[PDB]
Point group: C3
Chain length 328, copies 3
């Protein structure tokens, strides 16, 4: 088969691809370097992170159903921990987890057949308590396996997006001093026991998009134009989420994220199960600011799960109009 | 278009309406007054509440798909906070949030087109941390946008309800003294910091139907007759719920709440995503008491999420019979 | 109608049955003894348990749609509490709860018609705060009501399983000393107040399959062969779960668990609503170890929600291959 080498792009963006496969099956070649580093989650909150390719989430991979995926995974010598990868897209050996365990200083190449269309989580899963710990330290991303003929709606009609944004949502469990301020450590291992204690409460200290509070707001805000069909691919490798586009809807939504299932329509809020990726298509109809949020609003605002979308275009009074301005 | 002025009715009831639109599109006129007040949630538990029209949830609005909605929203001078409204039913300006911010002493009129059929949350969302806070202080309701030709099942057959009940479920975060008793404040602002601390744990002190523990039990119990088709419209603006009619089922269920999607059938328990409204139709077959509950039973019983339904009619031994009474 | 007496088998196994009903409607006779006993959840963690037939979950019952179910329920004199049973499969009297309350020393026989196909929770529900308490002390199981003609897919095609495994997931709330170690009591009543306090946080101390941490790992691991179609019936009577077969998928999934609804396909992770049972069919394609987990990985690993499946057969390099072994 033809081989195709991809240059991955950081989230929320996506590497160059075509929705309708331009060729028959190919072998898709990707490479990622595991990067262990402390990352700033919020003003005075840091995580001893473990990442695929330096980002949280790991970068989005896009292939077509029936293609193969060959991932070269590298664990540089500066790292402290063994690591591996579990593709929920894959069949066998714990999603690849059982064939990809690498020590600092090693690399591995895994091939699998992308036999099933949909957005899928990939995540580290070295074994035992290392499994949740590596995930909640940021070690998860997404691979999107498109049907060879592109997306289809609930009636089998072809549908197309102008833009895909990959929204990786991640729950983190940063230990706190008695006064509520966050603790700092020299490395992930030093912080492990105190993190486990937070993990055991099941209460995230932070729940973020693109690896930090406000990553996708301000200068990081998503951009679109009236008329654009935007696919929002949303992963959550460990905990549930309930995405909502404030001022919009999900025109077509695969909340369980598998493209041969019929999508639901007109959703206000949908549901990403912890350990999965879903996808929602919306055509923007109005200009202005939108917020894309986890609609546990405490999770959205206090914990960090809020992105903004800035949309340019012409306002439509038929859809909405302020008939009487605030007055009194 | 014709204009129609509605008199809203408190939950769990619904204002006068027809399921199959009697006319072509109309402009529906509603008015609500924001009422800030301390409300009793339980025997020794009070909330500094912020309400639409004095109730938790805010009252149910019912219109048809393609109609317009013109809401006059009033923030009386006795109130302390600015407020607004986000209709998840609406397209643009943060659901109307960006066009409806009003100070105490002001009123505003918003128009929007109800372009999408389904039950939708409406909720206050003034901006930033005010957003979760106003919601968890009780500031949310529901608008139900019926298809012009009424409800249809999974096969496109017309279906009809005898009764709609609006069940508004709300999670609250009342601060506690060390001994577990609940704190009281002079106004919402005074209580804000202590409430944020509870909010951050993500653990509600109370989860209630119709604004208080036992609101829909005892004298508040819902009523029906064997043979009645009852639509249970269930909102939860901030947190997930898993509704269950004890002794019954969901005959037709739109758990994501959007009527053009095919409903599921025969459900024991369904799922309302935080930030959404769903709807379930059941035809009562047996008389007696039923409980309608969030089936996290701790949430149902300890937190307050239990309603009762008292059903009159004739018992059917073919469905169930006590063959041998307790004996020994 | 013919009467059929069943010998129940402990979970995760299932009593002898046929998927396509061999006869027209029958009356299915089951008997269960309530057993109150302290059970070991983990190395140094015990629960004052209340069980159907001595197991957590209670044993799986399997009947066909249109059959009757006659359960003889026995509360031996050594027990301390009244008990009853609520079949979510049943119509009327709080699922049978209102016809089955029995004191220690009593027995009762309930008949109901299994009018609806699907997997359903059954659980104790004596009344008031006894309801969540008996459930979280282990008092819940499942009845699976198969369509008379067996399972059908999203296109109405007959499908068949080789093996059903009943995975009962249960959240428990064991009180802790200040140092984080677990408390022991002489009986359930002695432990009640301290358990309520844990219940109120909504944070389980343990979340287990088949009644204990590691029940379904090690010697308890599930077994299958490449090619086997295994139905995983998954109940959670009180709290949500998000099941995942590591290294596999859900080929056909009824996450809300009602068989006349079309299943979704190719799922990575699905969702069991608290208070329900769902079911997922998978055909094993690769040999080796799999883990079946709640994909809140903290819940899976720290809390106990992990089962293993050991699969024998021939490896398929087309699906997955380690192209370059760890090297460096
Ligand atoms: Cu790792
Ligand atoms: Cu996984
Ligand atoms: Cu407000
Ligand atoms: Cu909203
Ligand atoms: Cu009991
Ligand atoms: Cu129940
Ligand atoms: Mg690179
Ligand atoms: Mg400090
Ligand atoms: Mg469209
Ligand atoms: Mg009025
Ligand atoms: Mg006090
Ligand atoms: Mg019917
Ligand atoms: Mg026996
Ligand atoms: Mg101790
Ligand atoms: Mg198949």
């Amino acid at each position: 088969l033809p081989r195709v080498k991809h240059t991955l792009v950081p989230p929320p963006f996506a590497h160059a691809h075509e929705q309708v496969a331009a060729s028959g099956p190919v072998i898709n070649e990707f490479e990622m370097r595991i990067i262990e580093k402390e990352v700033q989650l919020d003003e005075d909150a840091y995580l001893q992170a473990m990442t695929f390719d330096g980002s949280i989430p790991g970068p989005l991979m896009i292939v077509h159903e029936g293609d193969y995926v060959e991932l070269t995974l590298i664990n540089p010598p500066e790292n402290t921990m063994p690591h591996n990868i579990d593709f929920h897209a894959a069949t066998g050996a714990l999603g690849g987890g059982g064939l990809t365990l690498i020590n600092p200083g090693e690399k591995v190449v895994l091939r699998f057949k992308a036999t099933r269309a949909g957005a899928f989580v990939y995540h580290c899963a070295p074994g035992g308590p290392m499994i949740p710990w590596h995930v909640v330290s940021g070690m998860a991303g997404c691979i999107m396996v498109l049907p060879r003929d592109g997306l289809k709606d609930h009636e089998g009609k072809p549908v197309r997006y102008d833009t895909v944004y990959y929204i990786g949502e991640s729950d983190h469990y940063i230990p706190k001093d008695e006064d509520g301020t966050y603790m700092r450590f020299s490395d992930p291992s030093e912080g492990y026991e105190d993190m486990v204690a937070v993990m055991d409460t099941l209460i995230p200290s932070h729940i973020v998009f693109n690896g930090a509070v406000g990553a996708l707001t301000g200068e990081g805000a998503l951009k679109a134009k009236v008329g654009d069909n935007v696919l929002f691919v949303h992963s959550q490798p460990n905990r549930d989420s309930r995405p909502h586009l404030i001022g919009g809807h999900g025109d077509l939504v695969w909340e369980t994220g598998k493209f041969h299932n019929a999508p639901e329509r007109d959703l206000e809020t949908w549901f990403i199960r912890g350990g999965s990726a879903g996808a929602a298509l919306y055509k923007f109809l109005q200009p202005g600011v939108y917020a894309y949020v986890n609609h546990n609003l405490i999770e959205a605002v206090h914990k960090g799960a809020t992105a903004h979308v800035l949309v340019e275009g012409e306002w439509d009074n038929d859809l909405m109009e302020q008939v009487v301005a605030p007055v009194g």
